[PDB]
Amino acid sequence: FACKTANGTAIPIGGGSANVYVNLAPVVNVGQNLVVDLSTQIFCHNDYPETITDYVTLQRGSAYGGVLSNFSGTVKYSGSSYPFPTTSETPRVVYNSRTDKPWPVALYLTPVSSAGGVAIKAGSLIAVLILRQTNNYNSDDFQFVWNIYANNDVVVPT
């Protein structure tokens, strides 16, 4: 089991950490959601699906910078939503193919009532998402740590 990113970096067997750079909607209104879709950013596969089934969770999602200060919301993992920043580990998604498969995570972030002007700064860290991988074969339990950076400013109109 290993993963790769839309920025051309990787995390091999055994886990590790990578950076992800996301283009964000430039304007988000109070009462609306900023969508941060990681399924177009992070892709993983199973290295021996003939005999092994891989299990993958979002172990913890943490907010930083302008997301931490100016937004609330949810994380959608494989069709179900949970609070973000996270308060538990999600259920598992099965990886059962060598073919790249997106990691089905997206953040839905809404501005807090006090937000206005530049709410997320270009280049800044917005989230850290920990992917936990196990299997039905051995006792491997690996963390793939994804540091999510904004590529651009996000403005919340007054």
Ligand X SMILES: O=[N+]([O-])c1ccc2c(ccn2-c2ccc(O[C@H]3O[C@H](CO)[C@@H](O)[C@H](O)[C@@H]3O)cc2)c1
Q: Is 132 in the site for ligand X (CB under 6 A)?
A: no
Token output for 108: 């839905």
Applying CB under 6 A, among 38, 42, 43, 46 the residue interacting with ligand X is 46
Rounded-to-5 percentages of helix, strand, coil across the chain: 5, 55, 40
- Contact of 118 with 103, CB cutoff 8 Å: no
Q: Is 135 in the site for ligand X (CB under 6 A)?
A: yes
Applying CB under 6 A, among 6, 13, 68, 122 the residue interacting with ligand X is 13
- Contact of 98 with 74, CB cutoff 8 Å: no
Q: Is 94 in the site for ligand X (CB under 6 A)?
A: no
Binding segment for ligand X (CB under 6 A), chosen from 44-52, 111-119, 124-132, 143-151, is: 44-52
Residue type, 140: D
| Secondary structure class of 68 (helix, strand, coil) | helix
- Nearest approach, Cβ of residue 115 and ligand X (Å): 41
Applying CB under 6 A, among 6, 7, 29, 48 the residue interacting with ligand X is 48
How far is residue 146 from each of residues 8, 16, 61, 112, 136, measured CA to CA in Å?
A: 14, 9, 10, 25, 24
Q: Is 145 in the site for ligand X (CB under 6 A)?
A: no
Applying CB under 6 A, among 9, 25, 27, 47 the residue interacting with ligand X is 47
- Contact of 101 with 44, CB cutoff 8 Å: yes
Binding segment for ligand X (CB under 6 A), chosen from 51-59, 76-84, 107-115, 116-124, is: 51-59
Chain residues that interact with ligand X, rule: CB under 6 A: 1, 13, 46-48, 51-52, 54, 135, 137, 140
